[PDB]
Amino acid sequence: AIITPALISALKTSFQKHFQDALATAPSTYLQVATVIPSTTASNTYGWLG
Amino acid sequence: AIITPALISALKTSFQKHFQDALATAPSTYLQVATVIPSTTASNTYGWLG
């Protein structure tokens, strides 16, 4: 006649991490639509002739 | 010739086991819809991070 706190609830229970980091995020797709340009200062300026 | 119909008429037979295992049962399928998580106590508690 063990008291409920020390029962299947807590005393008899094993922790498992099968659900961890299983639901993923949508795959990255920004490369297909955008291109990467590096920078090394506060801003970047672009110019073309015509 | 003449004989009781409970000895010869009963023993003039050849038992065969063709009918055994003639049919089958539906194949296992729960693998395609479930994973197997072994347990070592009364219950298993699961926890994952957000």
Author numbering:
A (entry chain B), B (entry chain C): 2 to 51
Q: Could you pull the original sentences from the published paper?
A:
Bacteriophage Casadabanvirus JBD30, from the order Caudoviricetes, is a temperate phage that infects the bacterium Pseudomonas aeruginosa. The virion of bacteriophage JBD30 is composed of an icosahedral capsid, long flexible non-contractile tail, and a baseplate. Using its baseplate, JBD30 attaches to Pseudomonas aeruginosa via the bacterial type IV pilus, whose subsequent retraction brings the phage to the bacterial cell surface.
The icosahedral capsid of bacteriophage JBD30 is built from 415 copies of major capsid proteins organised in a T7 laevo lattice. The classification, performed as a part of the single-particle reconstruction, identified two classes of JBD30 capsids. One of them contained minor capsid proteins whereas the other lacked them. The major capsid protein of JBD30 has the canonical HK-97 fold common to tailed bacteriophages and many other viruses. The major capsid protein can be divided into the N-terminal arm, axial domain, peripheral domain, extended loop, and axial loops. The capsid of JBD30 is formed by pentamers and hexamers of major capsid proteins. Contacts between the pentamers and hexamers are stabilized by the interactions of extended loops, peripheral domains, and N-terminal arms. The extended loop of the major capsid protein stretches over the peripheral domain of the neighbouring subunit positioned clockwise in the same hexamer or pentamer. The three peripheral domains around threefold and pseudo-threefold axes connect either three hexamers, or two hexamers and one pentamer via interactions of α5 helices to form a phenylalanine lock (Phe192). The N-terminal arm extends from the major capsid protein core, protrudes towards the neighbouring capsomer, and forms a small hook that reaches above the spine α-helix.
